[PDB]
Amino acid sequence: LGRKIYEFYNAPIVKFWFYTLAYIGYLMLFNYIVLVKMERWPSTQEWIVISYIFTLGIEKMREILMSEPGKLLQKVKVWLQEYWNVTDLIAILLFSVGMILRLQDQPFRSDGRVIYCVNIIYWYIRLLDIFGVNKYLGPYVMMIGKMMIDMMYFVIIMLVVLMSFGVARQAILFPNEEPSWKLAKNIFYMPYWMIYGEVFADQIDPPCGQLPPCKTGAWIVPAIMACYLLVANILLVNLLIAVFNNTFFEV
């Protein structure tokens, strides 16, 4: 019976499923601690999450030490050649920074909460990473990678067109705003949600002069709005339809 239980629990598939179940429980307790409170001292669930992170860091150090090269900088560079190890180490230092900030008093506790939320984001991306075992999800994952590269180039071209329209809009309308960083907020705010649905129907050609007087060229903003969203939405979004279709053939 001892040989039976020892032969079962050392199997790699058993190790994979046990690690996946523990990761699922980790993501559960992380959700619980980012929704439910924290005080001057952490709760038991948050102490468990801290224990999870620190033992993962210890295991990553064991991965670094027990590798194939024999020189320290060589094996550190070999371990850091993988991208997921790099982002894992970045997240471990992020969680330790957030835990140091959260163990201090206010206002550092809310900053630690913010770091905890962006680490949640990363650990859900790690759950996406683990989906390479499934034969139906792995192709979708490499789609996410190649489509992300093609959307990086798309985001460059979209960013040029959207930034030009936003600069033109915020320079025609609102013609009396002094130097402030909120101008960049407006020019990146308004067209970006304009693409994705909501066209801000109240904000386009409001009745003026019937009410404040009309700014000069206030009729030009509906025309450049029509031209911008038209070519933006249809030309680039369809373009990405064609791009992602011709990526899927090779993948």
Ligand X SMILES: Cc1cc(NC(=O)[C@H](c2ccccc2)N2CCCc3ccccc32)no1
- Residues engaged in binding ligand Y01 (CB under 6 A): 27-28, 31-32, 35-36, 155-156, 158-159, 162, 179-185, 188-189, 192, 205, 208, 214, 218-219, 222-223, 226, 230
Of these partners, ligand Y01, ligand X, a second copy, none, which one is at the site of residue 182 (CB under 5 to 8 Å by kind)?
Answer: ligand Y01
Of 19-38, binders to ligand X (CB under 6 A) are 19-20, 22-23, 26
Distance CA 162, CA 192 (A): 7
| The one-letter amino acid at 31 | N
CB of 70 to a second copy, least distance (A): 39
* CA 140 centroid distance within chain: 18
Of 115-174, binders to ligand X (CB under 6 A) are 126, 130
How distant, in Å, are the alpha carbons of 107, 117, 175, 206, 222 from that of 218? 45, 42, 11, 9, 8
CB of 242 to a second copy, least distance (A): 4
Report which of 12, 93, 14 is spatially closest to residue 56, judged by C-alpha positions. Answer: 93
* CA 218 centroid distance within chain: 37
| Segment lying near a second copy (by CB under 8 A), choices 52-60, 71-79, 88-96, 172-180 | 172-180
Among 34, 50, 56, 239, binds ligand X (CB under 6 A): 56
| Segment lying near a second copy (by CB under 8 A), choices 6-14, 63-71, 89-97, 213-221 | 213-221
- Gyration radius from the chain CA atoms: 26
Contacts (Cβ under 8 Å, ≥6 apart) of 97: 115
Q: Which is nearer to a second copy, 34 or 50 (CB)?
A: 34
Of these partners, a second copy, ligand Y01, ligand X, none, which one is at the site of residue 181 (CB under 5 to 8 Å by kind)?
Answer: ligand Y01
39 conformational bin, left if phi > 0, alpha if psi -120 to 50, beta if neither: beta
208 conformational bin, left if phi > 0, alpha if psi -120 to 50, beta if neither: beta
Of these partners, ligand X, ligand Y01, a second copy, none, which one is at the site of residue 52 (CB under 5 to 8 Å by kind)?
Answer: ligand X
Q: Which is nearer to ligand Y01, 62 or 182 (CB)?
A: 182
246 touching a second copy, by CB under 8 A: yes
Distance CA 173, CA 169 (A): 6
Of 64-83, binders to a second copy (CB under 8 A) are none
Contacts (Cβ under 8 Å, ≥6 apart) of 117: 34
Of these partners, a second copy, ligand Y01, ligand X, none, which one is at the site of residue 21 (CB under 5 to 8 Å by kind)?
Answer: none
How distant, in Å, are the alpha carbons of 190, 191, 236 from that of 162? 9, 6, 11
Residues that bind ligand X (CB under 6 A): 19-20, 22-23, 26, 52-53, 56, 59, 126, 130
